[PDB]
């Protein structure tokens, strides 16, 4: 406001390829909370599917540890260490065209 | 304790005597060569915080009370508990009917009126 301006007090003083990246530690966070309660920590024959393309991510990177629960990761691209950690956690990677 | 004022004369703006366009309301001189800002001899004095009066007697009239502006009988009632501290001063736009009502109520309450004999 003009009233609080300090010129009110000077009166009188003479004056590429689109590819957002997601790391492994956030892969389970993308999935909703009720599915995590169902699939995470339980040895179920059916595994959850995390299509990281539908969540606005182009590539899955390898930062972080995944929990030992297997999970199917559907994506376009994946860093070489990321899918190493994925099968070490028991999951598989399905590259999406 | 009595009321003593460090000064009685008002502070006049410089050369307000000489010029009718220059009002007597104080204005601090910004002139670099202003001998009056430099505090030369014979020149008039400038407002200083050293002229501030006693805290315990500031805002107090000669009688020792503080003037309080009053518009109606409701305002006077607010001065019931401070009749030895505040003196009621009826506003200048209060009609003659409300003047006499305010004065009577303050007199009954024991509250001083500064300008009672008016209108």
């Amino acid at each position: 406001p003009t009233h609080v301006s300090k010129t009110r007090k000077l009166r009188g003083h003479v004056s590429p390829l689109w590819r957002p990246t997601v790391n492994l530690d956030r892969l389970w966070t993308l999935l909703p909370n009720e599915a995590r309660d169902k699939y995470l920590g339980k040895n179920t024959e059916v595994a959850p599917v995390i299509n990281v393309l539908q969540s606005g991510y182009g590539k899955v990177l390898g930062k972080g540890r995944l929990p030992e629960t297997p999970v199917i990761v559907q994506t376009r691209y994946v860093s070489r260490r990321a899918e190493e950690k994925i099968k070490q956690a028991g999951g598989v990677v399905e590259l999406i065209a | 304790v009595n009321i003593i004022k460090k000064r009685t004369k008002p502070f006049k703006r410089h050369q307000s005597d000489r010029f009718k366009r220059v009002g007597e309301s104080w204005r601090k001189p910004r002139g670099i060569d202003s001998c009056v800002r430099r505090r030369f001899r014979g020149t008039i004095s400038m407002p200083k915080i050293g002229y501030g009066n006693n805290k315990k007697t500031r805002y107090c009239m000669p009688n020792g009370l503080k003037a309080f502006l009053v518009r109606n009988v409701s305002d006077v009632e607010l001065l019931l508990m401070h009749n030895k501290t505040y003196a009621a001063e009826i506003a200048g736009n209060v009609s003659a009917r409300k003047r006499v009502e305010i004065v009577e109520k303050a007199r009954a309450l024991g509250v001083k009126v500064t300008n009672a004999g008016a209108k």
Binding site: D25, W28, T29, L40 | -
Partner: protein
């Protein structure tokens, strides 16, 4: 800074409460808390629930029942999945952090509740947030 620029009435109430506690006790904790309440938001960075979980069970761990105290926001850390039991007192909790701590863990506390529980700061861990920003 003798007073905070915040006009929040409840922040002023906390400052009043810890003004008394700082001067009527001999706790360097209470003096520290009063100073951090005066500090601006720039100097009160958020601390994550994961860093709190780390600093409790770090090195020799020995967290026991010690209550974590931070003058700031305890933001959640969604990367960590299984949340331990924690007792934190803070200015604010993000809705995620408060929900996660309560569901699987201990309790959340405000700074007035902590002053009742531990007026002298006994068995309290005073944790700051990373200012590297």
């Amino acid at each position: 800074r003798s007073k905070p620029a915040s006009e929040n009435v409840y922040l002023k109430l906390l400052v009043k409460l810890y003004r008394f506690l700082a001067r009527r006790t001999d706790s360097r904790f209470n003096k520290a808390i009063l100073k951090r309440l005066f500090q601006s938001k720039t100097n009160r960075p958020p601390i994550s629930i994961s860093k709190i979980a780390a600093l409790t069970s770090r090195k020799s761990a020995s967290s026991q029942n010690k209550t974590t105290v931070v003058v700031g926001t305890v933001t959640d850390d969604e990367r960590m999945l299984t949340v331990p039991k924690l007792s934190i007192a803070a200015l604010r909790f993000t809705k995620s952090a408060r929900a996660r701590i309560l569901k699987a863990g201990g309790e959340v506390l405000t700074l007035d509740q902590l002053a009742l529980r531990a007026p002298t700061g006994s068995n309290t861990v005073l944790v700051r947030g990373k200012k590297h920003a």
